[PDB]
Amino acid sequence: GQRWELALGRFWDYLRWVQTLSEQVQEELLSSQVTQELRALMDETMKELKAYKSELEEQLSKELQAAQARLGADMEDVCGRLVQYRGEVQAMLGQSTEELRVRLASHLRKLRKRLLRDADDLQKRLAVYQ
């Protein structure tokens, strides 16, 4: 798999871990190491892609780009969702976070179904373009 899928698979690896929302994920989630690494992995994912699409140009370009702006949104979504939780926690004064995490994890499962297909789609859309 080209540089971009390898990049996306690393994002997938870290997300799968976040999802478990174990106290350890929660620790680094509120320190925001989780969000910092999530954004570094998403960005490396968009370069290797940005570079792939551009270089597939040098040797249909709207949808491609409509499909790229999709996987983008999907990743920006996860990070934006994790950074929101962090926000809602340091403002609740230590009262229970279980319902906020039941919601975060549902939302997170939902974005996973999208990363799956929007990329599965982005892929066939890069193959035909070639």
Side-chain angles (χ1 to χ4, degrees), residues 25-85:
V25 164
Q26 268 166 98
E27 280 299 62
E28 299 160 41
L29 224 188
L30 311 166
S31 48
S32 100
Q33 158 179 187
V34 157
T35 284
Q36 258 156 199
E37 232 287 46
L38 225 9
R39 180 128 97 93
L41 281 157
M42 138 179 29
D43 284 342
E44 159 200 48
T45 303
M46 299 285 94
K47 317 198 323 227
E48 246 100 287
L49 182 68
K50 141 172 241 256
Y52 191 47
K53 156 175 89 127
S54 272
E55 130 186 359
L56 242 120
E57 238 118 51
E58 263 218 337
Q59 206 350 151
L60 240 187
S61 237
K62 207 175 146 259
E63 295 182 298
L64 184 84
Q65 142 111 357
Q68 174 176 302
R70 265 189 331 244
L71 176 78
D74 283 344
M75 299 187 281
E76 253 143 46
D77 261 13
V78 162
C79 174
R81 218 95 219 200
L82 297 175
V83 155
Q84 168 177 259
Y85 172 86

Side-chain angles (χ1 to χ4, degrees), residues 1-8 48 52 55-56 123 130:
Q2 319 228 169
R3 307 205 65 174
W4 89 261
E5 284 151 289
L6 253 31
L8 171 62
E48 246 100 287
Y52 191 47
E55 130 186 359
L56 242 120
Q123 206 213 15
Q130 286 216 249

